[PDB]
Design a protein around this ligand. Sequence first.
Ligand SMILES: NC(=O)C1=CN([C@@H]2O[C@H](COP(=O)(O)OP(=O)(O)OC[C@H]3O[C@@H](n4cnc5c(N)ncnc54)[C@H](OP(=O)(O)O)[C@@H]3O)[C@@H](O)[C@H]2O)C=CC1
Ligand SMILES: NC(=O)C1=CN([C@@H]2O[C@H](COP(=O)(O)OP(=O)(O)OC[C@H]3O[C@@H](n4cnc5c(N)ncnc54)[C@H](OP(=O)(O)O)[C@@H]3O)[C@@H](O)[C@H]2O)C=CC1
Ligand SMILES: Nc1nc(O)c2c(Cc3ccc(C(=O)N[C@@H](CCC(=O)O)C(=O)O)cc3)c[nH]c2n1
Ligand SMILES: Nc1nc(O)c2c(Cc3ccc(C(=O)N[C@@H](CCC(=O)O)C(=O)O)cc3)c[nH]c2n1
Ligand SMILES: Nc1nc(O)c2c(Cc3ccc(C(=O)N[C@@H](CCC(=O)O)C(=O)O)cc3)c[nH]c2n1
Ligand SMILES: Nc1nc(O)c2c(Cc3ccc(C(=O)N[C@@H](CCC(=O)O)C(=O)O)cc3)c[nH]c2n1
Ligand SMILES: O=c1[nH]c(=O)n([C@H]2C[C@H](O)[C@@H](COP(=O)(O)O)O2)cc1F
Ligand SMILES: O=c1[nH]c(=O)n([C@H]2C[C@H](O)[C@@H](COP(=O)(O)O)O2)cc1F
Lengths: 505, 505
Amino acid sequence: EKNVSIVVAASVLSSGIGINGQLPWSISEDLKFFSKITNNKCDSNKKNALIMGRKTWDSIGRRPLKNRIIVVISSSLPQDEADPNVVVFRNLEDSIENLMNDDSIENIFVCGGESIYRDALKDNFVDRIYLTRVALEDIEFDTYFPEIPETFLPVYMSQTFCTKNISYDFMIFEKQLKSIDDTVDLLGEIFGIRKMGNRHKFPKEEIYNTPSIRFGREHYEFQYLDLLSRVLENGAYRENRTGISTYSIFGQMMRFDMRESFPLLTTKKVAIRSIFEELIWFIKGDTNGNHLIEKKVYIWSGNGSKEYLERIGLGHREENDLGPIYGFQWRHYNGEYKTMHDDYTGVGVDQLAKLIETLKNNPKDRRHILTAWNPSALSQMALPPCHVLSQYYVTNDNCLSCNLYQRSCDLGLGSPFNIASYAILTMMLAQVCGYEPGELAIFIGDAHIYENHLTQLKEQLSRTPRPFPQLKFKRKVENIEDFKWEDIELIGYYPYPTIKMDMAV
Amino acid sequence: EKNVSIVVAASVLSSGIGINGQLPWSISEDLKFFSKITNNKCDSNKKNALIMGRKTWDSIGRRPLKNRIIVVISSSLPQDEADPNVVVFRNLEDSIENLMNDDSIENIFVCGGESIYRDALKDNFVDRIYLTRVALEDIEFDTYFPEIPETFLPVYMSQTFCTKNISYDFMIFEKQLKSIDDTVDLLGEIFGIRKMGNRHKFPKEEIYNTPSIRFGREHYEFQYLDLLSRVLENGAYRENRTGISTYSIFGQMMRFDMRESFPLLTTKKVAIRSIFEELIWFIKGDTNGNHLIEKKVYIWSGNGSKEYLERIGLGHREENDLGPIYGFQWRHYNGEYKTMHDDYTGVGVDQLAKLIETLKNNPKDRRHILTAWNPSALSQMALPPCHVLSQYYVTNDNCLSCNLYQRSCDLGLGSPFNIASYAILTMMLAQVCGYEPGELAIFIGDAHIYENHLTQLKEQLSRTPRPFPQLKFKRKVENIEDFKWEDIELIGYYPYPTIKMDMAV
Ligand SMILES: NC(=O)C1=CN([C@@H]2O[C@H](COP(=O)(O)OP(=O)(O)OC[C@H]3O[C@@H](n4cnc5c(N)ncnc54)[C@H](OP(=O)(O)O)[C@@H]3O)[C@@H](O)[C@H]2O)C=CC1
Ligand SMILES: NC(=O)C1=CN([C@@H]2O[C@H](COP(=O)(O)OP(=O)(O)OC[C@H]3O[C@@H](n4cnc5c(N)ncnc54)[C@H](OP(=O)(O)O)[C@@H]3O)[C@@H](O)[C@H]2O)C=CC1
Ligand SMILES: Nc1nc(O)c2c(Cc3ccc(C(=O)N[C@@H](CCC(=O)O)C(=O)O)cc3)c[nH]c2n1
Ligand SMILES: Nc1nc(O)c2c(Cc3ccc(C(=O)N[C@@H](CCC(=O)O)C(=O)O)cc3)c[nH]c2n1
Ligand SMILES: Nc1nc(O)c2c(Cc3ccc(C(=O)N[C@@H](CCC(=O)O)C(=O)O)cc3)c[nH]c2n1
Ligand SMILES: Nc1nc(O)c2c(Cc3ccc(C(=O)N[C@@H](CCC(=O)O)C(=O)O)cc3)c[nH]c2n1
Ligand SMILES: O=c1[nH]c(=O)n([C@H]2C[C@H](O)[C@@H](COP(=O)(O)O)O2)cc1F
Ligand SMILES: O=c1[nH]c(=O)n([C@H]2C[C@H](O)[C@@H](COP(=O)(O)O)O2)cc1F
């Protein structure tokens, strides 16, 4: 018995692998991954056999790969006994004689060819599958990768990598001590809620996104999805200011990479434009909700309405005057707020400007902080800061990392918007201060799910994540408030269909 | 071959197990743990054999344990063939006939008796050890547990539990797929710092506290020690405002239980009194450093000195006037600061009072927040807020949890003080609002280690953690500012010797 693995790079959605006798992309990291995953062996006296179709053998220029034995499947090619590194077989079944014979082979890799892949899967010869998902689909294919049968299960999904603005992921599909566990379970039986481990129970399979992936949950969307599962599992059913009660947990975090990708969720189509527009709406220090509504962004509609304002004791307020809310605290901290029409230029403390200036004049400073929590202005605000305070870090290799603390988190609506918003903000601050994006860490206080989002989020959990998209700016601005929506280019975003969820006013 | 495990409850330090023919403690959870861990089996047709000394057999009143077979070691006790649940052997070696015969036994437990433990270890018959450390040493013992030989290694250390104000823990000592790992390593070879996984490398064994404990690192001091290892591994060497450079990492967190213990480090003797005194110094809203120095607490000496003040542009300031530093922002937010002698009563926003009032009048609120970051007052402060903003959470079972964000963290000096300080503060707020302590989550921005603390912290990492102590208040106060040091009772704190480390001014 010998292990037979499949190595293949296919597109994310249609699973295209080739076009016109060649690859529809050029990724050096992918080819290198192939070379390394095929050169991996234990015995130095042994080699790995590489099975591929005739057309694939033509694709590589009919030249052998070093330290490996290429097996070409063809009905026309002759059994060229000259080259000891290349061998030709009539059929795929007969080609797998590496098992019964030639103990000089340690591993077998089914390496190419839709005609080869399809009948290597159909006749069940494959043990493992190394799938390299690539994030393009608006191109032309003529050769596809066959749909993976239910006999295989994903056990690994790497973080999203980027090469030439192309997103890609590495996945592994597999064909499928007690003492500590027992002790912990027993202690969990003796002590009840006393044992903190029982307060943070591991999510059940029924609410665990892609349960088969246990140790290889490297993709950073899992940082959010596993949180969703955790709230869905240990969430204490509690009431709030709105009529809709939530399942809530306290003290959580999510990490994100921004160097090789952009933390925009793929399990649900997220309105990026609204996020950006809200972000630059903050940056300008604007508190007029209509300015957001005029651009067809209605995320601040419910918290702006006359009924809601009069209800929270702000009946004197105009139809969409949100008050000294974010941006106003960024650009005019401790500034006496009147109306949304007044010109608050020069007044208050401009945290954002000083933040940029400090970021570029003193990167290794341990104070880069932007806050929005102002006790003196909380009573005037239409809604107190959820994403309360942020801190920025400049690494030694000139990268910009961002930490954000969030007192309250709507895992259905608010969360993705916050992640993407502070990601984009981090990128803006990076370009303005002359750095590159780094990492995004979000620390959450009250992580909760509204009871009217249950079926929706449980639907979202039934979707296996796709590689994060890329975000590129079309032009470099001199002032951070000069950013426009047309300046934003989102590359390789192929998310699952949108999920409609109502906001609790 | 059959598994032979040792079950024993010993004191934390001197490893005492008995006094005057009985136990020096009464812990129902421990006895229950024994009963479970000895009743654990797979085959219903089999039983577990318990080996114990004659005196131990006398200790249990000479009555058999249900669903188990008690094996008594005695040279005088007759071989009672009456009771089929109790059997007597003349020596320990002969007693281990359960291995060669009687297939009705599934597991063997060496259950008691220093005379039994010692020669069960000396003749090497034990495979596993279930040690229940107990936190009391100022009592009398006559029977001890022999020192564990180097052939055993800890693989598990539970969280500190509390029964009758006694701290205890459960540990296991043992006598001692590749594909995903290979793939991740290869990706780590291809992509360099691009791969975020390589930016957060797992700490090496040389700097990993108790490396043998891999999957059973349940103790919450590991939340700090593993952080220490992480900074010690991935720490970017960078400069700062002080002449002493630090190794720094960004975006971390530590979780702590306060229900069954008190997060006070045992690997180093921490000055609790100074921590408390500083805490109530904050609560009163006092900014006079002398008030702290008068009580022999010198943690704010360096950041108060005339030289340091004149250096940071506060030469007009008095010898120890720190300015609108924490407490002043807690009790008098946005209050115009003059000197430390002025009476700031009634001025500014009292965040602490409103926090308490909101905590008891509206527990399920999501705005329980105490901040200290005031951009308008930062220039006047002797040192900007490190523990910047905190949020509090009342649980459905009336427990009080606390989250704290810290922009900058001195893992040598500041960190333990912060943990203990906000733990005590959480407990105070719990008693004043009529709740019980819950969990403490600390989210850290710039987690760094000063280069002059290296050998010291590397020394601290060489110490295997002990169970957390307990903190109890001797009286219930009406006002939170009425707390006194005499009202604090620290029970079961047996830490490793103190480690002297200098503060970077
Ligand atoms: N991104 C990726 O992971 C990969 C992509 N590719 C792409 O695939 C494209 C081409 O693949 P594809 O069109 O499917 O052709 P194939 O790669 O499957 O190779 C075709 C050859 O296989 C031989 N063959 C197939 N079945 C049999 C059989 N039952 N008996 C004998 N010989 C057989 C044929 O030889 P004969 O005609 O003599 O009978 C034929 O010439 C390439 O452009 C390449 O870029 C290839 C590998 C990997
Ligand atoms: N906290 C814990 O985990 C535990 C604590 N304990 C404590 O230990 C205390 C007493 O233990 P300890 O003083 O060590 O006495 P032991 O528990 O070891 O039991 C003593 C008996 O062992 C017999 N014995 C020992 N060695 C031999 C031998 N080589 N051949 C024949 N018989 C032998 C003796 O019988 P004989 O005199 O007839 O020769 C003796 O009566 C108790 O008070 C109990 O509370 C006990 C178990 C667990
Ligand atoms: N993830 C992935 N990417 C692929 O390109 C394939 C292929 C097709 C293929 C197979 C091998 C190569 C190839 O030239 N590899 C090289 C290139 C060397 C290098 O760039 O480092 C090698 O092993 O030395 C190029 C294309 C077959 N299976 C594949 N799987
Ligand atoms: N209870 C509650 N939850 C919230 O998330 C908020 C917010 C922030 C916010 C964030 C997202 C939305 C929102 O409607 N997002 C959407 C729709 C986006 C769109 O079509 O414009 C979605 O992707 O499902 C609306 C408001 C503002 N006020 C809120 N109140
Ligand atoms: N952690 C630990 N604690 C101990 O007390 C021991 C002992 C001594 C011992 C052994 C057994 C008992 C005992 O009565 N166990 C019981 C009590 C029942 C109960 O409280 O649930 C049982 O199994 O039903 C009491 C003392 C031997 N080894 C021990 N290890
Ligand atoms: N660079 C730097 N690091 C810090 O930790 C601080 C602090 C807070 C602080 C926290 C702890 C101490 C401290 O000396 N701790 C000690 C000694 C305690 C004592 O004996 O009183 C220790 O346990 O090692 C001193 C100051 C205040 N200013 C600081 N500046
Ligand atoms: O960016 C946001 N993210 C978010 O999650 N909320 C949600 C969280 C909360 O459930 C709701 C109202 O906040 P509060 O908890 O004070 O009622 O708004 C609001 C935002 F503006
Ligand atoms: O509670 C504290 N905890 C702490 O870690 N510091 C350290 C962190 C920092 O390294 C140093 C000075 O802060 P800064 O980074 O602004 O120089 O004080 C200070 C405190 F008061």
